[PDB]
């Protein structure tokens, strides 16, 4: 199917408690494969998936060089952004950056990404053309001018169309037994009486990978979008994910309700009901 690679950078200032912390993590789809933390006893890029362990010392050294450089650069950037917003030196602030490449089912580049936020709010983003920027405000306009002078968009385009895709395809091959294996959800419906004439039907999906899943309840063939409690998809801790959808139903009407499950790992989409 479709695949993506993403790096997520978080840089966090902390006045009075040392220099800003820099954390970087890398993902292929819903699988983390690397980490770096400037707060570690001996900061170095570390493997987080078995299939990345085969990469040579030069890979790990180059990664560590990049993230150590970024640690220093983002500390300067935090100082810069504090100034752009006329903020005091006393407050803690966060820059986040998210970048990477999407591949279609055939393996070609679908699109590239490079987006930044400041204190949880969108700040600047590389446009889909990989040539121009969208700045959120007059502060981000300063950043835009800097990056246009340093030809950052051009450098990112070269990476996103080239090395990003090349490395992603390599990881997909090296980790094919997991990264290119969709695990279907194990599904069941539970029944929980709440009163004499109302009961909760909960539709469970367990042990699935990747995280993308559709879980809906239907009453007489009609979607119960407003009446359904749908929890956030959550990690099991073994690479797989869990989700449930619940609806409060009148007693004796349970068979009018159907749960519908859509996921990549299923040979066919599932229709489920409560089995007394």
């Amino acid at each position: 199917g479709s695949h993506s690679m993403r790096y997520f950078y978080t840089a966090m200032s902390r006045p009075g408690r040392g220099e800003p912390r820099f954390i970087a993590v890398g993902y292929v789809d819903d699988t983390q494969f690397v980490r770096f933390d400037s707060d570690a006893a001996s900061p170095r890029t570390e493997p987080r998936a078995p299939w990345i362990e085969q990469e040579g010392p030069e890979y790990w050294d180059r990664n560590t060089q990049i993230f150590k450089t970024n640690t220093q650069t983002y500390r300067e950037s935090l100082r810069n952004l504090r100034g752009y917003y006329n903020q005091s030196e006393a407050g803690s602030h966060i820059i986040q950056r998210m970048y990477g490449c999407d591949l279609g089912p055939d393996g070609r580049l679908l699109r590239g990404h490079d987006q930044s936020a400041y204190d949880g709010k969108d700040y600047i983003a590389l446009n889909e053309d990989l040539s121009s920027w969208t700045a959120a405000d007059t502060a981000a306009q300063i950043t835009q001018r800097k990056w246009e002078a340093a030809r950052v968009a051009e450098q990112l385009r070269a990476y996103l169309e080239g090395l990003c895709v090349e490395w992603l395809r390599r990881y997909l091959e090296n980790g094919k037994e997991t990264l290119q294996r969709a695990d279907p959800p194990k599904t069941h419906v539970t029944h929980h009486p709440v009163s004499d004439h109302e009961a909760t039907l909960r539709c469970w999906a367990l042990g699935f990978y990747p995280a993308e899943i559709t879980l809906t309840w239907q009453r007489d063939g009609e979607d119960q979008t407003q009446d359904t409690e749908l929890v956030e998809t959550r990690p099991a801790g073994d690479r797989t994910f869990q989700k449930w959808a619940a609806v409060v139903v009148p007693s004796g009407e349970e068979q009018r309700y159907t749960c519908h499950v859509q996921h990549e790992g299923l040979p066919k989409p599932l229709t489920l009901r409560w089995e007394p």
């Binding site: 790096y7 970087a24 990049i66 993230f67 950037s77 810069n80 952004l81 950043t143 800097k146 090395l163």
Partner: peptide
Amino acid sequence: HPVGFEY
């Protein structure tokens, strides 16, 4: 592999 500047 990550890409190899200030805001």
